[PDB]
Design a protein around this ligand. Sequence first.
Ligand SMILES: NC(=O)c1ccc[n+]([C@@H]2O[C@H](COP(=O)([O-])OP(=O)(O)OC[C@H]3O[C@@H](n4cnc5c(N)ncnc54)[C@H](OP(=O)(O)O)[C@@H]3O)[C@@H](O)[C@H]2O)c1
Ligand SMILES: C[C@]12CCC(=O)C=C1CC[C@@H]1[C@@H]2CC[C@]2(C)C(=O)CC[C@@H]12
Length: 325
Amino acid sequence: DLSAASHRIPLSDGNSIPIIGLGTYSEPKSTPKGACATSVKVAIDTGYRHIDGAYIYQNEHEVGEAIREKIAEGKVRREDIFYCGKLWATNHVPEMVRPTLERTLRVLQLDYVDLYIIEVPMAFKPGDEIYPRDENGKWLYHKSNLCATWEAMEACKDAGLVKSLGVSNFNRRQLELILNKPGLKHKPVSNQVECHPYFTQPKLLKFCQQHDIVITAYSPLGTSRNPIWVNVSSPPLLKDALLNSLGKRYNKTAAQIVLRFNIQRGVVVIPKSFNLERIKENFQIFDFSLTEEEMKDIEALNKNVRFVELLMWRDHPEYPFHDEY
Ligand SMILES: NC(=O)c1ccc[n+]([C@@H]2O[C@H](COP(=O)([O-])OP(=O)(O)OC[C@H]3O[C@@H](n4cnc5c(N)ncnc54)[C@H](OP(=O)(O)O)[C@@H]3O)[C@@H](O)[C@H]2O)c1
Ligand SMILES: C[C@]12CCC(=O)C=C1CC[C@@H]1[C@@H]2CC[C@]2(C)C(=O)CC[C@@H]12
């Protein structure tokens, strides 16, 4: 079923997605130029065929550079690569959707993206500033309309600029608002959310499965733990005693165990790493499997505590984390 050479799982629209991808977020201020490009190329050489990025990460051009060079090398064909892009909060005005995607297509120098998703369910005031706030530090929000934005996304697919549509950071209510929309033409094929052994997403996963929506786990290794976004109160996932003990059973690292955990349950993982050794390590999860008991042991680690709470936007009408799921 899942092997290094063939590991694509089905999407409800007829397309498919590699069960493991390379995450590409890296702090802009302290990340050397070229580190992303180099990493993406190392990943493709390693065997990865899926790359996750976003215009707001500020390195989307580097992802494109790497993908085009490898195609030019004859390493892969455009159809062999799966790239996911994202529409940020400051770009939810319907008429802004296509222009925003076209901007990313320019940056990448590609004809289309394989997956385009609404980054967050919250709308922010339009503009160049990714994180808008007035002189008093008050966030500049905009009025959300998930159905009008979704229709704009559907138009992008019809025009051939993207293969599949999806969302990120959506809770159950926000998903059903789209699923029950009158005249729905293209239903969400995936929902990218935080998911790992400390936050297994049991109810949201079950719901998505019932609707043929595939969950992509972001921060599958528990994040880089940057105090600005991470609830450092929760201990380091990769230091967990059990996860490390289970690794010794197969001569695998904790990271490898947590990644295998999610892919074995049908959850796509997009671990980020700009380190040669680690990029390779994270991909070695097809030469072993976890027993039924081990899957249960890992599941029991769930604390129902998120590393990514986004508390700075807790008062936004569409803040996704107030509901149980
Ligand atoms: N849609 C959204 O709202 C959203 C939000 C957050 C993240 N994401 C996506 O999800 C991707 C993954 O999440 P993430 O970057 O937050 O965190 P992550 O994948 O959990 O990884 C965090 C840190 O783990 C380290 N690491 C990687 N492999 C390792 C290994 N084998 N052993 C020990 N440490 C290892 C990395 O350091 P090195 O690079 O030094 O190896 C990295 O800084 C992102 O890059 C992004 O593409 C999406
Ligand atoms: C990757 C990241 C930084 C390093 C870290 O330690 C934890 C996170 C998770 C939340 C990410 C953030 C980067 C900026 C993002 C994309 C947003 O604008 C909303 C979600 C947020």
